[PDB]
Amino acid sequence: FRIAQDVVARENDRRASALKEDYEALGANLARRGVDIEAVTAKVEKFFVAVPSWGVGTGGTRFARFPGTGEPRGIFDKLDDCAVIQQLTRATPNVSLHIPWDKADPKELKARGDALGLGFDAMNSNTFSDAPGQAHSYKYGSLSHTNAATRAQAVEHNLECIEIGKAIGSKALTVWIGDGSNFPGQSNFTRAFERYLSAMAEIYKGLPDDWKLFSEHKMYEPAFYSTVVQDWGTNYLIAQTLGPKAQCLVDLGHHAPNTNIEMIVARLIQFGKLGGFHFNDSKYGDDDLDAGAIEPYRLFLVFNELVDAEARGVKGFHPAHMIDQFHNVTDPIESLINSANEIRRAYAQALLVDRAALSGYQEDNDALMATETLKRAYRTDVEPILAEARRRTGGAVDPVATYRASGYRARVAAERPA
Amino acid sequence: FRIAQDVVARENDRRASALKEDYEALGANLARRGVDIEAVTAKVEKFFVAVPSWGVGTGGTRFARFPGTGEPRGIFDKLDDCAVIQQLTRATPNVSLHIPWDKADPKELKARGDALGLGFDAMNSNTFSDAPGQAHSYKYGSLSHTNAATRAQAVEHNLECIEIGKAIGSKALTVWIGDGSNFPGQSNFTRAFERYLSAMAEIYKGLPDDWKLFSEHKMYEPAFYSTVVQDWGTNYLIAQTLGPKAQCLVDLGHHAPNTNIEMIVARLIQFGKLGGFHFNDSKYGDDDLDAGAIEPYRLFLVFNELVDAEARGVKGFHPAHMIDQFHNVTDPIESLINSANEIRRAYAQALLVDRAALSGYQEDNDALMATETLKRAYRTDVEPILAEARRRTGGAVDPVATYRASGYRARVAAERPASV
Amino acid sequence: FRIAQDVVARENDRRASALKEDYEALGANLARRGVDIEAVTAKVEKFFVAVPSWGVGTGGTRFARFPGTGEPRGIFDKLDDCAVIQQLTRATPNVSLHIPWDKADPKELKARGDALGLGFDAMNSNTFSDAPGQAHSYKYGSLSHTNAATRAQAVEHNLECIEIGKAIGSKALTVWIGDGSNFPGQSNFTRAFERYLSAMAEIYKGLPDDWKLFSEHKMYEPAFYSTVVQDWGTNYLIAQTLGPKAQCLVDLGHHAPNTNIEMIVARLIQFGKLGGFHFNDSKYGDDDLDAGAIEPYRLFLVFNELVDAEARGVKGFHPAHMIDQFHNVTDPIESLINSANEIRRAYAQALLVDRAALSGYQEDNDALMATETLKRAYRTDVEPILAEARRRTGGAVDPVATYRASGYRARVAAERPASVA
Amino acid sequence: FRIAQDVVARENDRRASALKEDYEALGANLARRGVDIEAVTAKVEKFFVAVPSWGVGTGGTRFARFPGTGEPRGIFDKLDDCAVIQQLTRATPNVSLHIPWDKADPKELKARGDALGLGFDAMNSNTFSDAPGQAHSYKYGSLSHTNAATRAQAVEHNLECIEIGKAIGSKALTVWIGDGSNFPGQSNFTRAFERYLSAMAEIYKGLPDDWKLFSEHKMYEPAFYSTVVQDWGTNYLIAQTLGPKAQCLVDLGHHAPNTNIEMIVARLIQFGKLGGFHFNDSKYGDDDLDAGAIEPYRLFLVFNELVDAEARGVKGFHPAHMIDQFHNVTDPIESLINSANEIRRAYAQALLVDRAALSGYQEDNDALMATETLKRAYRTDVEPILAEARRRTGGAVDPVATYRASGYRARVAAERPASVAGGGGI
């Protein structure tokens, strides 16, 4: 227990009375709306999203990095910090690892995870930066590099990530690369994509039959003119070409300005290629900000498509959920805590949508009532449900409040002198 | 001839000396670069782009329309004006018709086109607006409308367009609809797309053996929250689902801000689904401005992909080329003339690219020289090639100058009554 | 009464029990947070936003217009419909007129307004389209047209708008023009702006002592390459150049993609040039959609800046609030009703922000708690407050439901002839 | 001479014949258009743009940095490399320094510059990152930080930059900060701006009489929700508030998608606040790519506004031209060479515009001919003018070709330590 159980209990009891009042009030309101609050809480308690190992330490921009106190010094420290997020929110039982950033003895990583009550989600490969002793540089690409030996090196790296994942219980490999060009003419769009497809086919050949392979598209950065896997269209072509175990991963901040992202989600679901999500928020580019902190309605609309898929009777749909954020000006743990909370908030609200009423307004082309039907769910303050879900499962009514009351940051600051 | 031949001859003669000097100079410059100017001229003279019947009349915005003089009323007046563009540029032998705007007896349409030296490109259906006496409104959609009878009406309309096209020599149907939603929840994205795919399959069944069906994606407008055929990804799904006769049409101004459009073109070519283009330029949204007037390099980069596809003999590559613009503050004929010119300009420059050198710099990851290889072609003023191509084929050395010298606008202004 | 009182009464009674339960529960929650729900409701019931006359009829795009039934015949029918919105929401007592669309005898306009319990907000001029009989066309511009005679014609039109406004009770003139270019080189940016400044200076000379002149910026449309009054920077230069009576109007959908609009609002307030707002929502361009239907948080963030101005004690701050929307696929009256509701919703939430706590988190650079302080207010479902405000002021607990129960649309559909040409 | 004179001569002689043919042909073409090619070349030879010291080293993104061979060890190596750009293009006689990156003995800097034939443009302060031994962190801001002591430290740093600039010959200070917020509510927009204005007022008081203070706006990055100096409107307020010595700097890649940047330039000129430029190109965000490599017409349109002003001679009007780019996948020197060339290319084409004809088409509302009047100039290949300008001023006909023939990169690679690849960071 990273956070003392007496502190969690103390801070829960301090807020118990108010929560009971709010939960009962919301329960009565939902009952008048024909909704059983217990049914919603039950589902919310089971919604999990993976926390990124790279999100526990302070992040930075190309201009600078401003570390806070008690910065995790490596993957083991990061797991310790991830354990706090899970203990308090109970929404992040699994951690996403990144190789080679998190290279360490796989057996030990698993042992630490087991002891902390943490599992492992999809592995993440890294061929967008060079490691010491690397024979070929990824400056001009990796899986799509013009040099055969460089592509082979990239493929081998991904296979190594799979081996590490098999040792810790991971069941998927997420591949995001920076491959692209900064100048017109630098790359031949088609040949580069053909090279990428051939290299990914080699990774697919080495992909276990109990694993999934996720490709992540991105409009730009680090490539500023063209990117090989630039959007969901190219991503679909990739997944379809590689095989049934290959699917598309949608990172919210990787789309062109004003893109209707929830529609992309719906399209990928319809064609069975929505592998998972990388949650975060943004306003300008791939800002990697706390989920829902900028555009909470958009997050709700994405979850509205996920819940509709269930309502439509879609089968075999269990998308992977992961947070992909960098925290440059906040306590990383607090941001991950509230981000995970925001994701459950949007999910809970999506569950409140009166699907029967919405379907009726859609068929009758009553646009105003259709949108108001979504708003009635979205406007509902589901915090009491999120808090009760946490309380009932060993977490904290007010996660960040308990975190601060525990003095954890000051504790690790003292344990991790810099 | 819409424009008197003696006027064309006269306006060519007064500009012939300068063209001779510039063509010979460009010829020597290209010769020093290992390029045969005549070879480029040969390709340029065979590049054609269809002119839109809806482009010769003055366009407008939702705020207002400011018509000019001699506004063409009806397809017959429009064809007469399109004929001027072809006569002077020799780059627009075919016209794109839009139904019901251009509805007229098929035999009469074909007869008029033949007399004017004009052919007909892809037909364009219209289920994004309501025509008088229409049984079902398209306010909430057409091919993807929730009402079965409304979808059937839209399908029937498209089949009618195919019948008209068959009668006049067309070999394709372009389908662009406004279908979408203005509010979250208004439409179920998936169900709407399912309805669209089912309706399009019916249209597909009515396609002759040698016809193509082009679906045109658009991010937004008239729908301001979601659009069924919103981007090339959805467009690809449509084409692949419908069959080999179905391909994607790319309209330059229909993409999100900063989109790499030339890459979309490359992707569609690789998978054999680049049905064609709707050329125009833009800066903010689907502005429908004169091609190349805002971002000429982007137009060149699109053509770089087109010329590259040819260079490597890509299978199934044969996109249709069409101009889709609205002229709100210029003489429509002049804008179409210069737009067709800009399109041939970008094509000619793409032809100048040293493909062998480019491939070398790409393989060696010499980004600077690779981009400079494209720039050497793009920086070349190919106007002499475009002008000489026109001069040798019955066109005008300076199309707009000849147009103005002819007094054509004043002529039709006298034959056509304005509102006031 | 456009809507029968017995219908409003019956529909309010039908929902009285639920409103009581929700309002009281919210009241208890707010109290635990140190907020007096009564204080919030009292301010909410006093928040007004002007309804656009051009928003009562169905709108359209450059591709098509799909009118509904009972479209207004003219301004008088539009005022009658605005009376419905005000009766039910009690948040829209004033109407924004547009000349020449709403041109009519000022005495008659005032008479109808008074009879319906409606007032008039800022006048709106129209030199972005040609009216019959004009000696000069606005095709290539109006107030910034290269032709002096054309500029003079546009100036006189704006002065006429002021005269009409003075007669009906208006106290401001909003000037939005399409002036700009579609091609590089078509216009000399500086000279076009100078011409505009000269024309606006003339209009300024016609302003009564207690009037304001609002200039509205827009990035593009109808001009697709450059627009004279393209953004808030140019707008500020206009207001500062003209004088103390000249201020800037911010229309939410008139900014470049990803623009931080709430900051623009803050900047104009700081330099005393925030004249007012044109509320609406959008996702792509100037979509003119129902306020808050696309990005409700942004709307709240704009109001957060407005309320912060009061918190900072900004003297003499009385921004005009107006809705500027077009309803292409809904009953215009219903959209305006829910849009006014959404505006009061964002306002109410902004009032809930614990600014004492917020100021502390800002000082200590506690970004997470600072943003959570805003979210605690925004996440609060203030619908009970909006509904109670309506109940106590003669409005409807559920405006659209009551509107539908009244059968108003069918009624006017039988009284108003549809366009046949 | 960084590049052997015999190499420059040899590589010019090799291309002299073709240049003569192209220059004479262009000369005849321009003569038919009523333009004297010599008058254009004369102006082009005098057009200068400052090179960024931070541009000669390989750049990086927040994801990774892939240095090449012969990376500069410090400011002295950087000046040596900048000397190559000036020798071959003759368009970059001045270098822009950044403190503390280029901190060194002022006398030594001045000495190296004088020896290389290089001068110094505007100084650039750095309060967007923390330096070793720094008392107060700029994590939450600098000039607009809530903490008074932090703002004071930032002000003092800027004054130090002025002192260094005075010693080496600089006549301006460019201030770009990352100050902003990543979350709604984190910052009070107004109070933050008030703090910024007050701090800048202190910096302004320390400005010499013949110096300029340039504030640089940026929509976002590093701040991802709000930025204090976010656009030209705020920038104008800053310049107008501070005084006549304060002007606005326009960096091309710092605007919202689809922004009409050339209009911003015109507006700033109209109100006398166009301090200068930071040239580069971009497609998505502040990409910092080689000028003109992505949107060459936009660069020409910006220069069209500059030449228009340079034509009707707004006097004393001398905006500071500077390149601000990062080169992540090319030889930094080659990119700066071609970028400077591209800037002169746009300038040259703008000089070809028939101003009288354009004015006429504008007054007559002949939109088509007005735009064609601009295109007639833009379509002209002015490379012969650029190459001849270089040839007769001591530069190279084909700069990059000569650079490669000289083997300079391989030369400095052998004179400098090898570099290691790593994570993000410019």
Ligand SMILES: C[C@H](O)[C@H](O)[C@@H](O)[C@@H](O)C=O
């Ligand atoms: C760290 C992680 O691999 C990374 O964030 C990618 O998922 C992608 O979002 C990059 O922009």
Ligand SMILES: C[C@H](O)[C@H](O)[C@@H](O)[C@@H](O)C=O
């Ligand atoms: C008139 C023509 O159908 C239309 O322009 C479509 O092709 C599409 O561009 C609409 O935005």
Ligand SMILES: C[C@H](O)[C@H](O)[C@@H](O)[C@@H](O)C=O
């Ligand atoms: C009708 C009204 O004048 C108009 O909407 C303007 O306010 C502006 O928004 C235009 O885009």
Ligand SMILES: C[C@H](O)[C@H](O)[C@@H](O)[C@@H](O)C=O
């Ligand atoms: C290094 C230099 O200070 C920096 O590039 C600034 O000028 C600004 O462009 C940052 O985005």
Ligand SMILES: [Mn+2]
């Ligand atoms: Mn990601």
Ligand SMILES: [Mn+2]
């Ligand atoms: Mn990312």
Ligand SMILES: [Mn+2]
């Ligand atoms: Mn089109």
Ligand SMILES: [Mn+2]
């Ligand atoms: Mn279009």
Ligand SMILES: [Mn+2]
């Ligand atoms: Mn408006």
Ligand SMILES: [Mn+2]
């Ligand atoms: Mn508007």
Ligand SMILES: [Mn+2]
């Ligand atoms: Mn800069």
Ligand SMILES: [Mn+2]
């Ligand atoms: Mn920058």
